């Protein structure tokens, strides 16, 4: 019983002026997890807080990129173990469901 996993990442792209949504493909994949992690680790250094809202200036949308892997296990429940290991090996550890990992 070759199981499947769904590693999902969330994002929200700034809509370009008069662009077909078929563009956002790029806008979607240019901003993967690693990029989000190093962007958070980089802004922290010169980060200053201000109450004044800058979020209400433009129009944009929210979307998700999910990828899927597969594995075969002789045992039913052992699969998850491997998954977790592999996640720690190459992926972010989101919340887990039955298999689905969500970071958002």
């Amino acid at each position, epitope marked *: 019983t070759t199981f499947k996993l769904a590693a999902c990442v969330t994002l929200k792209c700034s809509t370009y002026n008069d662009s077909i949504e078929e563009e956002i493909q790029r806008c979607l994949f240019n901003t993967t997890t690693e990029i989000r992690d190093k962007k958070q680790k980089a802004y922290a*250094l*010169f980060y200053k807080y201000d109450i004044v809202p*800058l979020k209400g200036n433009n129009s944009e949308y929210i979307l998700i990129n999910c990828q899927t892997t597969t594995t075969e296990a002789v045992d039913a429940a052992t699969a998850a173990k491997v998954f977790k290991q592999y996640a720690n090996d190459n992926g972010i550890d989101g919340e887990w469901t039955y298999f689905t990992v969500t970071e958002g």
Partner: antibody
Amino acid sequence: EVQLVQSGAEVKKPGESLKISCKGSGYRFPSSWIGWVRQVPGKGLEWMGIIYPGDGETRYRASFQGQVTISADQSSNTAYLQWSSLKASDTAMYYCARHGRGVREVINAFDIWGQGTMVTVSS
Amino acid sequence: YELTQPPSVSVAPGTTATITCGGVDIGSTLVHWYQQRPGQAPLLVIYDDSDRPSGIPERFSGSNSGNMATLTISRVEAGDEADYYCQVWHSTSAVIFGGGTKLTVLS
């Protein structure tokens, strides 16, 4: 326009203090860092210092510590750089540049630049 | 922490140019790219590695990998000749600039 304007060029002698300015318009002064960068003619860019006026926080370079001073007048939306004593090695073009404060909406790099001010020290 | 930019870069007009910025584990941070024409203030042409300020055409692309950042220029025009610098914000060293790379469009 979101713009920054720097004071006029100056020629001085070693030992005399000097203060130069950077006045920005078109945006909220305290919501953005102001950085000062040095460029000896024919050489790279040398980041000297940076100031956040909202808290008055300042951060300098190891080398440019004892030499220079940075100030921020929030009331006039103005940044200032100063030497107590000048040297020859300080002869260069000086640039002041705005820098986002670490928010996704703003640009987190030196987006707006000034015209630059030439400081020439020669006995 | 130093940045290794190449001194000179030269390509023919209308061809794609690349500019390199070598850092130790540089992929673990965000690199920005600035343009400076001789005698004029610098201009932010790329930030967050790939993003483009307004008024910058699609001709400018950026990328970053483990130990090498790249800035790519498509449809090169004689108007893009100038000095290009890479810059980061290190955990300890604050702001660092690349040595600077002169780009020339061949005449």
